[PDB]
Write a protein that binds this ligand. Sequence first.
Ligand SMILES: *[C@@H]1O[C@H](CO)[C@@H](O[C@@H]2O[C@H](CO)[C@@H](O[C@@H]3O[C@H](CO[C@H]4O[C@H](CO[C@H]5O[C@H](CO)[C@@H](O)[C@H](O)[C@@H]5O)[C@@H](O)[C@H](O[C@H]5O[C@H](CO)[C@@H](O)[C@H](O)[C@@H]5O)[C@@H]4O)[C@@H](O)[C@H](O)[C@@H]3O)[C@H](O)[C@H]2NC(C)=O)[C@H](O)[C@H]1NC(C)=O
Ligand SMILES: *[C@@H]1O[C@H](CO)[C@@H](O[C@@H]2O[C@H](CO)[C@@H](O[C@@H]3O[C@H](CO[C@H]4O[C@H](CO)[C@@H](O)[C@H](O)[C@@H]4O)[C@@H](O)[C@H](O[C@H]4O[C@H](CO)[C@@H](O)[C@H](O)[C@@H]4O)[C@@H]3O)[C@H](O)[C@H]2NC(C)=O)[C@H](O)[C@H]1NC(C)=O
Ligand SMILES: *[C@@H]1O[C@H](CO)[C@@H](O[C@@H]2O[C@H](CO)[C@@H](O[C@@H]3O[C@H](CO)[C@@H](O)[C@H](O)[C@@H]3O)[C@H](O)[C@H]2NC(C)=O)[C@H](O)[C@H]1NC(C)=O
Ligand SMILES: *[C@@H]1O[C@H](CO)[C@@H](O[C@@H]2O[C@H](CO)[C@@H](O[C@@H]3O[C@H](CO)[C@@H](O)[C@H](O)[C@@H]3O)[C@H](O)[C@H]2NC(C)=O)[C@H](O)[C@H]1NC(C)=O
Ligand code: A1A6H
Ligand code: NAG
Ligand code: CA
Ligand code: CA
Ligand code: CA
Ligand code: CA
Ligand code: CA
Ligand code: CA
Ligand code: MG
Lengths: 214, 595, 466, 213
Amino acid sequence: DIQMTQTTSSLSASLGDRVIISCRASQDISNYLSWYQQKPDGTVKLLIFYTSKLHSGVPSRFSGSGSGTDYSLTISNLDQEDIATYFCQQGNTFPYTFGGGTKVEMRRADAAPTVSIFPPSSEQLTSGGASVVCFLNNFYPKDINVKWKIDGSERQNGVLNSWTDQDSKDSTYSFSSTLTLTKDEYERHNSYTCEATHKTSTSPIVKSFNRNEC
Amino acid sequence: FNLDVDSPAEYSGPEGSYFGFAVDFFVPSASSRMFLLVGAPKANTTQPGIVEGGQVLKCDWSSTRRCQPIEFDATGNRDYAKDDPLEFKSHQWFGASVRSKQDKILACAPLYHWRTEMKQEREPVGTCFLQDGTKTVEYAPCRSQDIDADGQGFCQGGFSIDFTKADRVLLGGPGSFYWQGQLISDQVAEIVSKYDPNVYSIKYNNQLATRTAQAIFDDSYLGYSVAVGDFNGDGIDDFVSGVPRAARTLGMVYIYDGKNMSSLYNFTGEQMAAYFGFSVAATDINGDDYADVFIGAPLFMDRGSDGKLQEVGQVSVSLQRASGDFQTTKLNGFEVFARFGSAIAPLGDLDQDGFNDIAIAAPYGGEDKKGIVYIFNGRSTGLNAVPSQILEGQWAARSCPPSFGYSMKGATDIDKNGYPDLIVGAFGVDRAILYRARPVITVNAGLEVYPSILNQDNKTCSLPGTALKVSCFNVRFCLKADGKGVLPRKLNFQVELLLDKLKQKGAIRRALFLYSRSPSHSKNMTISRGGLMQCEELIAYLRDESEFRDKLTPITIFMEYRLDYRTAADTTGLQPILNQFTPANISRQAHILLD
Amino acid sequence: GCALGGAETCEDCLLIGPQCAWCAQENGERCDTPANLLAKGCQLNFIENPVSQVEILKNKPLSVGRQKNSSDIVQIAPQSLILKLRPGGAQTLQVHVRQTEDYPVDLYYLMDLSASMDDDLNTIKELGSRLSKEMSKLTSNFRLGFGSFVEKPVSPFVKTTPEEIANPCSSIPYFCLPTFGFKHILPLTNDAERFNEIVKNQKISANIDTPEGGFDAIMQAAVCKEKIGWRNDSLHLLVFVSDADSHFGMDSKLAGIVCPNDGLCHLDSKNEYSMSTVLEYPTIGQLIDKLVQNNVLLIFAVTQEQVHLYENYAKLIPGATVGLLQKDSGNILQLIISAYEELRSEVELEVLGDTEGLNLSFTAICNNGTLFQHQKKCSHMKVGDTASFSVTVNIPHCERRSRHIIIKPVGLGDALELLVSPECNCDCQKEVEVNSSKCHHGNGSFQCGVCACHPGHMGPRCESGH
Amino acid sequence: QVQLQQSGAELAEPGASVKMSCKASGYTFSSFWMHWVKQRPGQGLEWIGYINPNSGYTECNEIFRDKATMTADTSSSTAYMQLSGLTSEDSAVYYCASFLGRGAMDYWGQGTSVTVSSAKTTAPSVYPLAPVCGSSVTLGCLVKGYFPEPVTLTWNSGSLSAGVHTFPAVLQSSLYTLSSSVTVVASTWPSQSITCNVAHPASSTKVDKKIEP
Ligand SMILES: *[C@@H]1O[C@H](CO)[C@@H](O[C@@H]2O[C@H](CO)[C@@H](O[C@@H]3O[C@H](CO[C@H]4O[C@H](CO[C@H]5O[C@H](CO)[C@@H](O)[C@H](O)[C@@H]5O)[C@@H](O)[C@H](O[C@H]5O[C@H](CO)[C@@H](O)[C@H](O)[C@@H]5O)[C@@H]4O)[C@@H](O)[C@H](O)[C@@H]3O)[C@H](O)[C@H]2NC(C)=O)[C@H](O)[C@H]1NC(C)=O
Ligand SMILES: *[C@@H]1O[C@H](CO)[C@@H](O[C@@H]2O[C@H](CO)[C@@H](O[C@@H]3O[C@H](CO[C@H]4O[C@H](CO)[C@@H](O)[C@H](O)[C@@H]4O)[C@@H](O)[C@H](O[C@H]4O[C@H](CO)[C@@H](O)[C@H](O)[C@@H]4O)[C@@H]3O)[C@H](O)[C@H]2NC(C)=O)[C@H](O)[C@H]1NC(C)=O
Ligand SMILES: *[C@@H]1O[C@H](CO)[C@@H](O[C@@H]2O[C@H](CO)[C@@H](O[C@@H]3O[C@H](CO)[C@@H](O)[C@H](O)[C@@H]3O)[C@H](O)[C@H]2NC(C)=O)[C@H](O)[C@H]1NC(C)=O
Ligand SMILES: *[C@@H]1O[C@H](CO)[C@@H](O[C@@H]2O[C@H](CO)[C@@H](O[C@@H]3O[C@H](CO)[C@@H](O)[C@H](O)[C@@H]3O)[C@H](O)[C@H]2NC(C)=O)[C@H](O)[C@H]1NC(C)=O
Ligand SMILES: O=C(O)[C@H](c1cc(F)ccc1[C@@H]1CCCCO1)N1CC[C@@H](OCCCCc2ccc3c(n2)NCCC3)C1
Ligand SMILES: *[C@@H]1O[C@H](CO)[C@@H](O)[C@H](O)[C@H]1NC(C)=O
Ligand SMILES: [Ca+2]
Ligand SMILES: [Ca+2]
Ligand SMILES: [Ca+2]
Ligand SMILES: [Ca+2]
Ligand SMILES: [Ca+2]
Ligand SMILES: [Ca+2]
Ligand SMILES: [Mg+2]
């Protein structure tokens, strides 16, 4: 099979900027390369076929170039509706194969996350089990790390995390981390700490509480 | 009956190009000068590397009588890869079918082949080009992803074509689905707006197409011929198509609804291998605003007086009725192996009598296969069974037969004289010919003889000489005429009277004219259109009883009226003609009294 | 009865009715029955009345028993007649037919060689010898030939890629020869093992659409007398062997072939049909014309799926029959023998020549005088039996030209030559006696007891002037 | 106006099979190939194969040769794909896409999610999240142990939308868990009541959880 590789998996851009996405095939594909846009909701649209030909209904901003093994999609004058993921696809030989994808996200000023930690609800404890939830909201850029320290010791066993799509109004991301235990284990220790490390501050932002205390 | 055969416009094309294989009229929307469209499917073109790509020509009407190719496509074969053509335009028969509606011209190449993008193939999907003034687009509805004989790879789309009243295209492709055939209809607006040269199989919205069916229907050739007309009274033209191999070679004609391609009505031939459905046409011939179906079976064999089968061809005429039924009649050819019915051309109202007319061709009839075209006039009952005119091809060929009449087109008044005109193609001699319709003069004639009863013993008249009197009576002949279209307001008629016409070679004529003393009187007359009855009286008498012993057989007064056609000519050079359906003779009779 | 409208000239009198006569002189309305004219006073010498008559020129008796000399065979009697028909008159000819016991037989085996006939080739490897051994019990002069057909080798009936042109089965893969129209391979011969050899050497071909091009081959096999080898004075059996529909007429229009078949022989140096890509397939009408003209009997040996179609074709084609062929031609020998035995047990009359405008009625007398039927065919007869036919002939109007006509049994060359000559003129017509005293001093001519007036003179004796 | 309308989300146990449909409109369905593409959650695009609708002929990526079978109903302009022998690796969104030609696929369906799981329909447990004993305040919900997707979550029946962050669901011991945060002005809570509204249609569940301390 033909292997397709889009070297950069993510890139950030501002409105109006020119964006270039590169795609390399493992063999000559004789210009049978197409480009697709996938929006957050899963919608998929064809933009460019046969290297440089524009699909009907597609705005002129999109154009494509290349030959042999190297190909590129170019977005000039980026629009808000252009924030999506872009895939290349060779159609020279079966099976058709796609590149790994390149995500285009809006550029923003760096913003520190607003962190909030939550102890298990009373309802959950009666059922058995305890979940500690930590929310990190409205931060840029997307990269961030969360560490759970009950008593100065990382757990990293029952933790589950979820991330939001980039927000449309403000190009920020958000993060939910949930440490889940048994009610027994929860009631054995006293302090509970949600630790966040972000590019914007050298010192990890820390939010914590003590179970006993109130 | 009013077509001018003395001085038809004669057009020619390159030898061997089949110039005249297809013909149509071209009338732009700006009321510009009209032209003739002529297909030459074997003509060589300037397209790089293309042999006998074929061309469609536009021909001036009488300004120069010249034909110039239309540049639908100047390019050669696109390449899929180096030394790997995407398509093959040589011997593609471009111009095998040509149709025009206002500004739009549709021309097709039923033998255009293409490669497909997966394997190196050579599949005759056919292609068409649609020209609308500046913009020209390719229309290849059968060049799809449904490949090979199973699909549309051998469809030969454009084998037959027509335009609907509402700017839809009707296209026939007789090869689809193992030669079941197919009908495809697209809106012209979709064909132009969705055209993209980078996409070989265009997705047209609101496309109507017949669907693949069971293998039993294979090799039927649906789409061999098409015509359009309304047959469920909703104002939307419906699709009529010949299916000449269907029903185990009896032939069928399918009618489909023009809104959704649902089956509406079927016709079935009566004889094996008659090629019923070779040609089809739709036109209202009986003046009830209901389109009627015409179907040609050029190989139909009739039984003769001696009991021998003879191939003369047959045409069936089906009048549409409000109930939805059809009233069918058959018309047989006149000459063996002439293939009467190969082409059927609605003429419009050729004689402007209120009923549409049709022309039926016998391309291999006449002397030395020169070809014959028959003109049939409509009437309220249906089509008149007897042809009122016979056009004879004038040119002979040295290889393929002249085929005068193989294609025809009428129903266009190209000289604006008020009568539709006719184009006849003759591709085996590379000729196309326009025949102009002459104005038609209708005459009302009257003849009165009083007293009707004659008594030999009633001598109240005196001859110019001594004579001593004779029995006399009065004869009063009247004539009145009018016309439609470009005509003068003054016409010279030759009128002849003959007394006692019943009596033949060697028999006594009992009545004579007073002055002439002979039984014949001739009078030249001058009459103007729209005018009043212009009459003239003269006097006649009987011989003495001594000279004839026949007082029983009646005395018939006969009147003829002819017209001098040359004197009534117009700027066109086009003489009018007398309406052949009113008889140009009238007769009354007197009687001898008995005692 | 014959005194009606017209009837004022001898020639005019004869035209209205077959049984009308014309009187001469007296001792208007001289047109009446010969008996009525005698009753009115007309003498027997004066009465004028031509009558239809038959003259027998050649009536050699029908030959009885096996004949050692091909020249003493007589299967139709009489052999030549002159039929003088009064305008409107009708005459009945008796025609007698008897098949001789030893009559030569030509059989041209014409075979579909498309890809579904591969098995068929394997099972007929010894058809030649098996067949001529059986036919030797029935005739001492059996000859057989071979020919093959597939399809017009042009788009859209074949694939036109280089690979498929070179081998239309390359896609399978399987060895097939290039598609071809018609190969005439073995002219008629008594050498049955030669037939075996050529069959054993045949390879199949292929094409892409079901209906085949065998009608082209039928036309060439019927018309190419010298190259096929048909001999006079023998049966001509053309056995068409196929498991498919047949292209006809303007089917070739799909391929851009739009020049009608011309009915001529077009075998080239390779003995292949050279107009395959040039001329339309024949129409049934064209095939009928040439099969009748070359006296070729067509036997459709076709599979179950095709029988009904080819039966309907055979209804239209004089002398044609249909046999039901197995998917591998396993029974082709039995089909041929059956069709041959049917032909030898039947006699069907055929009438050729200038027949248009004539009224013909046929009555057949079979099994000696016992059975009468209003057909032109006697059936279920033993070879040597005699079939008799009443052939009634009538000319409706008078004409000038004689008609040359032939009556013959379907399938046989023995012909009855018939000359139909009109007789619409009276004897007196040729004795004008112009300027006779009887028409007012030479104002006319005295033809048949009446005055034919000169121009400008009207009257029974031309006695008034205008 | 081409539109490919795909059928709804599929659920099945391992070893079972599912069949999904893709109805076409706006073009002549039988004249164009239909392609099928598989996207695993948090993964790329994978080409399965195509079908020629009018002839039934198909070609597949070698991977899916035994996994998928494509079919088509030309009278209803609908293509079908059946996935047989299901495993967790077959859990993904499956797209249909018409063939443009030129080695490209021009119009895509919205996708049909396929989830391969032994779990049985389980109702959610909704837990209120209040802070611990200051201009704005963040409250939250936790919806734990429900199956299958989807759940819908709103705050005060949708009155609060700005300042709400609802995260995608995550798998947790074969069941889905979900959380949502809402942020309001410190002066406006607890003085006014903020309520988590959670609905799990597959369970006929409708819970409202107010947050008090
Ligand atoms: C493909 O398209 C076809 C045409 O669009 C469609 O056929 C249509 O089907 C619908 C529903 O099945 C019918 O509507 C039904 O009508 C009946 C009663 O209908 C009667 O009255 C109407 C009204 O007449 C007015 O319009 C006509 C224009 O045609 C005028 O001339 C007339 O003067 C009036 O102004 C009439 O049209 C109908 O006539 C049709 O049918 C009769 C009987 O078959 C024929 O004599 C006639 O030629 C014409 O075909 C009819 O007399 C009502 O009871 C229902 O509730 C419903 O409203 C349409 O009438 C019908 N149209 C046709 C047949 O032209 C096909 O169904 C469609 N196929 C597919 C697969 O989608
Ligand atoms: C004018 O003449 C034409 C041609 O003779 C007629 O058109 C044919 O009409 C018949 C009758 O409707 C059509 O046959 C029908 O085909 C349907 C499609 O079948 C699907 O499924 C089969 C599975 O075997 C596939 O092979 C096929 O490709 C399709 O996918 C069938 O479903 C129909 O079956 C129904 O009717 C039959 C009648 O015997 C019942 O037995 C069944 O139970 C079922 O209810 C039917 O067989 C045929 O395809 C048409 N041919 C063409 C070329 O269009 C017109 O109807 C006729 N018009 C008029 C006005 O007379
Ligand atoms: C269009 O131009 C082409 C040439 O580009 C013409 O074709 C050439 O002319 C004739 C065909 O009429 C061919 O000569 C003939 O060859 C055949 C076989 O070799 C032979 O049987 C004849 O006796 C004659 O010599 C020639 O090969 C052919 N070349 C091709 C087709 O490549 C064609 O005639 C022109 N057509 C028109 C309508 O002008
Ligand atoms: C004897 O012969 C003459 C004919 O030459 C008769 O006299 C004519 O009689 C006719 C009547 O048929 C007169 O016709 C008139 O014509 C118009 C109407 O058509 C009008 O004038 C009258 O109403 C009348 O009908 C005609 O004038 C008269 N004269 C001539 C010269 O024809 C005569 O009647 C014949 N026999 C007898 C018994 O009178
Ligand atoms: O005669 C031949 O040389 C050749 C042949 C015979 C053989 F025995 C072996 C092989 C062949 C050749 C060999 C080389 C490649 C082509 O086939 N015939 C000619 C016509 C062709 O048979 C059509 C079946 C239609 C039945 C159907 C199938 C599918 C559909 C439809 N009809 N109708 C609509 C779409 C779906 C094979
Ligand atoms: C019989 O053959 C001879 C020459 O062999 C030929 O002259 C004659 O025309 C043939 N018979 C007929 C009826 O034509
Ligand atoms: Ca309609
Ligand atoms: Ca009508
Ligand atoms: Ca008229
Ligand atoms: Ca005119
Ligand atoms: Ca076989
Ligand atoms: Ca064939
Ligand atoms: Mg075959």
